Amino acid sequence: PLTLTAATTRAQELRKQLNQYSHEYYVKDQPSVEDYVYDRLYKELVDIETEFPDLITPDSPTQRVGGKVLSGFEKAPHDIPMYSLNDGFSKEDIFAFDERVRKAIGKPVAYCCELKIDGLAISLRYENGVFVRGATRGDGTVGENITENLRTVRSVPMRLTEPISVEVRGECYMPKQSFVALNEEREENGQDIFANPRNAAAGSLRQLDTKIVAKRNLNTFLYTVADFGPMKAKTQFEALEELSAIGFRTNPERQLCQSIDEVWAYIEEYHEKRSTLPYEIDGIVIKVNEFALQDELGFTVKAPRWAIAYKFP
Numbered sequence: 001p002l003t004l005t006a007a008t009t010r011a012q013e014l015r016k017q018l019n020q021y022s023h024e025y026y027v028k029d030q031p032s033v034e035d036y037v038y039d040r041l042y043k044e045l046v047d048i049e050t051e052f053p054d055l056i057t058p059d060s061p062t063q064r065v066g067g068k069v070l071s072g073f074e075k076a077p078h079d080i081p082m083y084s085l086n087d088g089f090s091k092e093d094i095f096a097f098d099e100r101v102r103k104a105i106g107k108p109v110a111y112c113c114e115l116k117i118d119g120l121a122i123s124l125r126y127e128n129g130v131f132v133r134g135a136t137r138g139d140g141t142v143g144e145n146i147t148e149n150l151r152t153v154r155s156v157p158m159r160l161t162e163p164i165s166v167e168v169r170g171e172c173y174m175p176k177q178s179f180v181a182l183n184e185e186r187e188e189n190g191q192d193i194f195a196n197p198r199n200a201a202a203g204s205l206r207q208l209d210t211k212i213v214a215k216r217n218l219n220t221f222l223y224t225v226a227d228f229g230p231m232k233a234k235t236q237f238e239a240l241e242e243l244s245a246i247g248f249r250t251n252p253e254r255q256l257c258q259s260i261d262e263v264w265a266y267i268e269e270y271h272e273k274r275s276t277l278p279y280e281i282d283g284i285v286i287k288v289n290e291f292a293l294q295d296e297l298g299f300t301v302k303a304p305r306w307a308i309a310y311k312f313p
């Protein structure tokens with residue numbers, strides 16, 4: 001029979017192979033192998049872990065189903081604050097924002113444009129490549145420690161390929177179809193439906209039973225880090241590419257605009273494409289691309305002066 005010695009080694013092989021397939025399937029939204037290939041290897045791993053429960057590790061794909069049930073969430077401080085964003089609602093506000101930026105910097109500036117995802121803001125801390133803390137934004141300086149729930153979100157890596165220590169921030173949301181499916185299930189069980197995917201994601205992440213959260217099919221998009229110390233990026237667009245390179249799911253609709261006019265074109269392009277996406281967006285976020293310039297602009301008490309969120313009506 002398969003010995004513990006042989007299983008210990010085989011278990012790691014399976015975790016690596018299965019995690020790579022999951023990265024392709026959930027993070028790149030582009031699987032390489034047919035589902036049956038993954039399922040077969042997954043079953044082999046489950047059999048090994050069942051025979052030797054000591055070989056179960058936090059980065060094993062079998063742990064995505066959750067199991068822990070908490071009494072409540074511990075406070076999760078953000079020593080590096082999670083700021084909000086100033087809002088814009090008209091072409092005027094956007095060009096005015098550009099005027100203020102040029103006034104302060106003294107030259108034209110490039111802008112990294114991204115879609116504003118309507119979900120729950122999250123901060124993911126990794127130490128030596130290992131996922132150690134998942135937290136909600138809360139009030140900006142203190143959120144809720146929802147690490148166990150986030151372990152079930154399939155697109156969240158449990159172990160990065162490189163043992164880097166960083167804290168990434170983004171949005172955890174519920175895709176349109178998943179939101180539709182969930183409300184139908186609630187109607188079937190006589191429960192109150194969620195008013196929108198935003199509330200569905202928030203309500204899901206507030207669940208104390210991780211097994212329930214694991215079935216809610218939440219997804220993620222990461223767009224920044226709390227401390228750029230371990231990162232090599234010097235611009236926001238570079239940061240998005242680097243986040244992708246280290247293993248996080250990033251939104252593919254971002255664009256680097258060299259002028260405010262290009263920025264407005266972007267806003268118009270995605271405004272008309274708004275309902276064609278598998279997820280809901282409440283606008284567009286415009287950020288001064290160069291970190292050196294973001295630094296020069298600084299932050300107000302509530303948000304950075306180097307970014308503005310154009311909110312859809």
Ligand SMILES: NC(=O)c1ccc[n+]([C@@H]2O[C@H](COP(=O)(O)O)[C@@H](O)[C@H]2O)c1
Nearest residue numbers: 021022025031032033034035036038039
């Ligand atoms: N083809 C692939 O690489 C791949 C990777 C992860 C999950 N899946 C599929 O996703 C579904 C859920 O599986 P997991 O809950 O283990 O993520 C299954 O139907 C599975 O086959 C496919």
